[model samples]
Structures are given as structure tokens and as C-alpha cells.
Target: GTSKLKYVLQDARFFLIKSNNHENVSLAKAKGVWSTLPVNEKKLNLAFRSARSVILIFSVRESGKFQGFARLSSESHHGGSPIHWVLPAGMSAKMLGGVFKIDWICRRELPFTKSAHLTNPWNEHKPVKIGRDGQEIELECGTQLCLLFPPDESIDLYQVIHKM
Candidate 1:
């Protein structure tokens, strides 16, 4: 017997949050930082306000290597409230005290070492074409990267659940 299960692609918004220091990378894996993101809150809210889902990819600013990723629901945040950052396993709020309110849902590590640079071939995997304003640009701290996951580009649910 063959098991067939897959996640369909939807109109979702993707974002990249970069860490300036290596210490911050450790902090992100252990516990998230405060509102240290240099993001345009207005634009961020507008982009995810009615989107299917929101995904934040954490990367090292200098190395361009992605550390990890987080999946946030459409109702994860609103207007001006602090966004509840969620990380994968082995990373949570307790490491630095849950005062920052990081919610850990997944129990497996979804480590990604691919470079998130605009010129990297890894872009072919997720396919970030434009921003919320309809302009092609590179991903920076808090920059909106509009991702379109076509049917063939969809993620495997079992893989995410079992592997990650």
C-alpha cells in the first residue's frame, strides 16, 4: 500500500528576519529576542492581515545562512500587538524566560542551511518574486517576501511533522 498525503499550496506571505550577531543566532535558537526587528509594522500588518499564512525565515545577516523557520497563523497578531514568535523544537521561551512570549509548537528541528540571498539557487525552492508593493527586491530584516508555492512546490506534511 502507498500512503499519499500532501499540503496544497495557498496564497501565503513569507518574511525574512535577519540576525546581526552570532549571539543572536544562539538566542533565537534558545530564546527569542524582544522587538529588535527593524521592520515596518504598518506594512507588515497590511501584508499578513488577510493572508493564508505567515512564515518567517531566520537567517544570519553576514553569512546569509538560514538558521531556522517559524510558522505563524493568520490570527497570530493584529494592529499593534507584539507578535508571538514561534520556533521549532530545542528552541523556546524558557531558555530566556517566557517573558518574550515565544510559543514552541513543533517538536522536531527543521534546520535549514541554505543561503537566503537573492542570487542563491535556493530561491528556486520557495520562489520569492515580489514584495507587498509589487516590486522585486532582496530580503532584509523584516522585509516582506511574497512567496508563491505552486502545486509542485508544495511542502510535505509528513515530512514537516516527522522530520521537523
Candidate 2:
């Protein structure tokens, strides 16, 4: 079974990017920029352009959870085999967030650490979903369940991983 969902009501601190393909995961692990569909290109750039460090959640649909994480840095270049935004090198992606689980369609609550704290009230910019039970549920993907998190808050990835 999955652990309890812990979250902070603040700006988006981390992003959940889904990749069903094994090759893409390999590229991310190798410290290479990943080339995938831009589900939220506008929102993604807003976070990437900032000087702050943003962590990308490597969500594998097949595994039904987060398999790894990577610190997106340097610059985003174009012109790859799939012809999409290619990320630059930084630190190799690590398999630290494997315990964080998600639903297949990305509609379930996120797997944040129990120690996670709230910074701001849940805003419209943050990604959320209205559940059948009339609850405000956080999502791990976009409208199409491709990307999650809007790139605003400052989430401590280390705290989330180690604290758990």
C-alpha cells in the first residue's frame, strides 16, 4: 500500500513529468536533457527561467509512481530525434523518490513527505482536481495527465525524500 499523502499549500515547488518510455528515463538518468511532449510548456518555462533550482519528478506510468528525480539546470536546447525541448546536463537523476506513488491517470493525491509544510494558500496557479467526493485533490499530471506542478513554490526535495 502507498503512504499517506502530505502536501504544503503554497507555490509549486516540484514538477511531476510523466514518461512511459524507458529510453526517456535513461536519458534523464544519464544527465541528458529529456525530449518529450510539452503538456504545459508555458508554465514549465516560467519555472525553468528562474535561477532557483527546480526538481523534475520522473513519473513512470508503468510503475504507477515516481521512479526518480533530477535537477533541471543549464539551458534548454532544441533539435533532438523527437524534435522537442531538450534539457541540459546537471547532476544525474537519482532514484530517490521511488516510494512516491501515483495513480495511473494521475488523479490521485501526491506522495509528499509527512514533514511537508504549508507556505501559502492553495492558489489557482497550482495544479488541482475536483474529485467525485467534492474534495480539492492535487494531481500528478496536466489536463491530459502529462505534467504536474506549476513551477512556483520552493519544495525541499531532500527534506521530502530523507524525512520520509
Candidate 3:
């Protein structure tokens, strides 16, 4: 059950982080040219570009009565090998409006800590996925970080599955 959808996103353009309030991440873009900070009011969106792999942290609040994945879309996907999740190396990407300020260049080791379930740090630009049986989504927290992986390094699919 730990083996669900595996994603291999290649040609990572940049690491993006969005939040209503700032938490624990500041991203450098274009090899140390620019960076983005978190905002306390309204919606804040940040974008960082890179020729190499980029780790974008997307966080937001989830509301409404949709406490679960109620749509048939999730249950309809065929259990195929890790294919569609792969991102091409030549892929182009971008981000919209947000405040931009000058920042320094540096590599980062960031983990999704705003939420209880996303306390794990992402140190590598590897593949990732979600186990069908162990699927979890947390939106009530002040912040949440979410991404896709290819079921490789640093991720114990077994442990994630066992917890469920």
C-alpha cells in the first residue's frame, strides 16, 4: 500500500513557496540573484529559478466541508509505473505576482515543518509519490508544505505506510 503514485520531476526550474504568513523558508533564485520572504497578511507567493533542480515549497490553508478526497478522480487513475510524474529537463516554468527583494545566493536544506505531518526535511531533488493506502492531507494547520517524490532516497515508504 506504500506504493502509490511516484513522481519524477526533472528540469526543476525553481523552488516556490506560498503562504499567508511567513514560516521557516527563504529561497534564493537565479543562482543568488533574488529571494522571497513570507508575509503575514494576504497571500504571499515566491518564485526562484535554476538551471539545476529546484525544490519549491507550496503551503496554504484548506477549508470547506471537503474533509477528504471525495471525488472519483483520485480513485480512477490506473496504478501505472512511475511515468507521468517525471518532469522533463527542458521544461520551462514561472510564477506570478508577489513582493520581490534582493537576496543572496546559497543552497538550502528545508523541510515542511509548519504542519505536524510534514516535519521531514527535503535535502535531495529526488523522486516522490503518495501511497494509496497511506494518503494524508492536512489543511487546518497554520501552514503546510507539499511536494511529489519518486520513491527514492530519504523517503521510507515503508515507514510512511506503516504509520497509517
Report lDDT (CA) for all predictions: 0.36, 0.36, 0.23
Off by over 4 Å in 1: 1-9, 32-39, 73-164
Clashes of 3: 5
lDDT of 1 by residue, 1-164 (tens): 01221121144344555555556556544553333222333334555565544445555555534444444432223234433445435755333221222222221322233223333123443433212221212333213222211122223344333422
Q: Using alpha carbons, what is the TM-score of model 2? A: 0.41
Of candidates 3 and 2, the better by TM-score:
2
**TM-score of candidate 1 relative to the true fold:** 0.41
| Each candidate's clash count | 0, 3, 5
**Shift of residue 163 alpha carbon in model 1, Å:** 20
What TM-score goes with each of the models?
0.41, 0.41, 0.20
Estimate the Cα RMSD of every predicted model relative to the unseen true structure: 10.5, 13.0, 18.3
In candidate 2, what are the lDDT values of residues 1-164, reduced to their tens digit? 11212222122235556665556565455434554333344444556565243445565555544444444443344432332223335522231111111111112224333113322123344432211111122332221122332232333334433322
